[PDB]
Write a protein that binds this ligand. Structure first.
Ligand code: HEM
Ligand code: HEM
Ligand SMILES: [Fe+2]
Ligand SMILES: [Fe+2]
Ligand SMILES: [Fe+2]
Ligand SMILES: [Fe+2]
Ligand SMILES: [Fe+2]
Ligand SMILES: [Fe+2]
Ligand SMILES: [Fe+2]
Ligand SMILES: [Fe+3]
Ligand SMILES: [Fe+3]
Ligand SMILES: [Fe+3]
Ligand SMILES: [Fe+3]
Ligand SMILES: [Fe+3]
Ligand SMILES: [Fe+3]
Lengths: 158, 158, 158, 158, 157, 157, 157
């Protein structure tokens, strides 16, 4: 089996995006933990682990088609200072990923490669779920305010 | 609910292929067991059982569309003498099945029958996995050699 | 050890008969299940599994004598629409098998090969039991009738 | 009940063969153990115990017919130095036993003594199984070679 | 499937013999129990139950061949007063059964009916075992004597 | 390490004696079982198994010294009809074994081979125990008589 | 109780040999472990522990006789680089120990001191077992070869 170079190009681009997202999410979780926002940090850490799982699946698919995974290239990592900025950066990443996923799914399904299309379909569903969560949190912050919102995620906790 | 004749023709052809594969894999497993190659025999027996399950699923799908399953056909069965020959025969069977599966999925999805397309998609994923395994084993035999490779799959008994 | 070609011919013929019976019984069980006759379907499925066991024993015996098992040849498979027709087809298959078994047992025991004769003896006992069951069911259907008999093997759900 | 002298002669000859086989197998197992070949030694010890059981059954049958079991005879015992020689000696013993068993079964069944014939039939089946094992091991040694074959049965522990 | 009338005749004869043996063994066990010979009665009861099982197997085989089992005919039942006499009667029954079994096995196997031959083979093995036991007990009684032998099978309860 | 040929000769002679004893004891146990003497048969089986254990130890010792064990020759096997005769045959075997063991122990210990001497010492102790048992049983049979003695080792089961 | 000077001299010499063997075996086990040969290392470590136990027993016996154990001596320690060399060094040590043990046992038993003789007898049996193992391993290496033999004792974990 030897896949088309275009399919492998799409998969490698998605892999680079996954690695960038992993780095950004872990850094954000550590930064949030340093400030005393424990409950946010737990959620962000879980999201980073999910990003790893996506990256592993993509790597396995690329290896099965007799390609060379790219572990050297990275995109630009966004770091925010307040919580609104972190949420906005995550939203940007998710939107880019969703657009790429849709275009790649169409292209792959046009050339009789169904398994890669199914992989991108699952990843797309997960990305949509995460973006919905991010938008809900941004709305909550907009309504309550930053201080009253942050008052609900701090624990003395030994 | 009455399916198109072409969809039923595709499904019956896949069923005939499944039955042929079941027979060939079971015979190969028995032959390997008779020679003292135990782990290979176990793996081949498991593969034959998986083929049996695939045949059952195909039969159910054909019956739901008010068709007549064909249990009288059979394609040519290939029997080898050394390990390399068995692996090569299995590879040939898998390649034929994968080509047929892709063409059938396209045709079925062009006529608004989605469930049959999903069935073929799952079968295609399984076939790709098995072909990958076969190619890996052929590479290992090429590198190590037949005697040193066979020395790793022989056991005494109790 | 190298058995006589006639003994191997007998064993291979019995193996072909076993494979044909396996296919016919499985197809009949699936057809019965599709109509709602669950209790008949369970029994037919069990019979198909027993036919597998017989085929495996025959294959092992053939391999021990340094022969080539035949997995390419099939006889004619009979399919019926009613239940009486299915029972009649099964009866025909059983009668043929019993006749072949008796002749083969005599021939094998005339040439000092006892293990093969014992194998055929066990298979013959099993076939006689199954034919007795089939005749009893046909008598019950004759006495009661199709509708009243079928009313006793239909179950709503689980 | 008093059996025919010829039946008792056959049974006593088989008993002498059993005793000789027991002695040879135990000596071979001890010799293999002294050299560091552990799994071979275990298998040979199990075979010796099986021959012990066969001798016991033969003794019981002889006693039930009001005869005198012979515990003073012994055939020539063969001892090898390499693995091939041991396997060849075992093969010779098995071939002799099988020939005697077939002739004895025919003679016994010609004179209306059925239980003795059944005893010989069971012993014959066991002997055929063992000879098949021996031939398989000889083929494996021929294919791999003595050094690579022996590398798979050595283990130093406690 | 319809068997030959001769095979069915053999099987029905062997069934009549089994019924006679069942009756004789149960009566002997009850008689032994009445006298206080506690340990003999258990063995005799077990033998009677084994005969019952043999009769059931024979009945099943006869029914499978589309025949009519005979439950009306009996042979002569022998009753002994001493223990030696009981053992001797049992020995006679066993010898008759063994002879009939061998002849029937030969005839059945000459006509391509193998399952019936196997049934008779199993029954023959069992009969040989029982006759061996009976002969051993007769030898023990001969060596020891009635009183010393009987002193070993009585119990207070 | 290579032992002296004389030590190996002694060990091989003891091995031949062990094999002969194994055969004789097993045959006697089977014969006793066929007659209905269950409790004697159990003891005889146990003795035969002990004789095998002795044979295995001797074989291991011979192999460690780079010798060739002899599994081809046997002595004369004694078979008796009564129980007194069986006991007498066993006594003869034991006496021969004990004499050989003492002479071999002295010779082995005279040449600086201690492990073989210890092996023979253990075997000698076991043989003395068995001979004591045999003599006790012969005395009991002499005092009671054969019938009254045999009446104590029979069961129905 | 005061033992003879010669008995104590023999015991102290055996103690020095034991200490030397302990050091050599532990060093060999560590060296084998550093190279990736795991099962050999385990076996050698067990052997070193056994030597430790032997040294303890010898020390106890020497103290019971009102003597002074020597913990300052040491014989030459042999270190190899390949497996064959290690096995050969161990064989040399074992042969020396066995010769000394036999001579000491004779001398001790000539002067009516039996417990020390029994101690040396047990140690001698153990030494013979170990030397047999070493010779078997050397034969296996000779037959298979160095690489194919080492391929069976390497584990990755
Ligand atoms: C066209 C021929 C055959 C068909 C359509 C067929 C079909 C099936 C199916 C669908 C099952 C379901 C088992 C499950 O649900 O786990 C089954 C059971 C089984 N069949 Fe077959 N089979 C065929 C030939 C054979 C042959 C030739 C053998 C033996 C040489 C065999 C051995 C078995 C075994 C062992 C099982 C049960 C596995 C287990 O319980 O571990 N089959 N069969
Ligand atoms: C070193 C040689 C032998 C070994 C290791 C050995 C080992 C054994 C063992 C462990 C048992 C079962 C123990 C028990 O259940 O009491 C047994 C049973 C038996 N052995 Fe041996 N034995 C040896 C020698 C022999 C010889 C030389 C013969 C015949 C000449 C023999 C004939 C038998 C028989 C017939 C049985 C069945 C015992 C029974 O069912 O009562 N054995 N053997
Ligand atoms: Fe992702
Ligand atoms: Fe398949
Ligand atoms: Fe069948
Ligand atoms: Fe045997
Ligand atoms: Fe009966
Ligand atoms: Fe002994
Ligand atoms: Fe030591
Ligand atoms: Fe496949
Ligand atoms: Fe059937
Ligand atoms: Fe054998
Ligand atoms: Fe009876
Ligand atoms: Fe003894
Ligand atoms: Fe040591």
């Amino acid at each position: 089996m030897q896949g088309d170079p275009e399919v492998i190009e799409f998969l490698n681009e998605q892999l680079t995006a996954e690695l960038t997202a992993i780095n950004q999410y872990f850094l954000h979780a550590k930064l949030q933990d340093h400030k005393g926002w424990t409950k946010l940090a737990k959620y962000t850490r879980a999201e980073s682990f999910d990003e790893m799982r996506h990256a592993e699946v993509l790597t396995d698919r690329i290896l099965l088609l007799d390609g060379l995974p790219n572990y050297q290239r990275l995109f630009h990592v966004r770091v925010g200072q307040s919580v609104t900025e972190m949420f906005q950066a995550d939203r940007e990443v998710e939107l880019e990923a969703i657009d790429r996923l849709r275009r790649g799914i169409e292209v792959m399904r046009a050339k009789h490669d169904i398994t890669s299309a199914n992989v991108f379909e699952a990843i797309l569903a997960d990305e949509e779920h995460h973006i919905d969560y991010l938008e809900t949190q941004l709305d909550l912050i907009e309504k309550l305010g930053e201080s009253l919102y942050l008052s609900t995620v701090i624990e003395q906790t030994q």
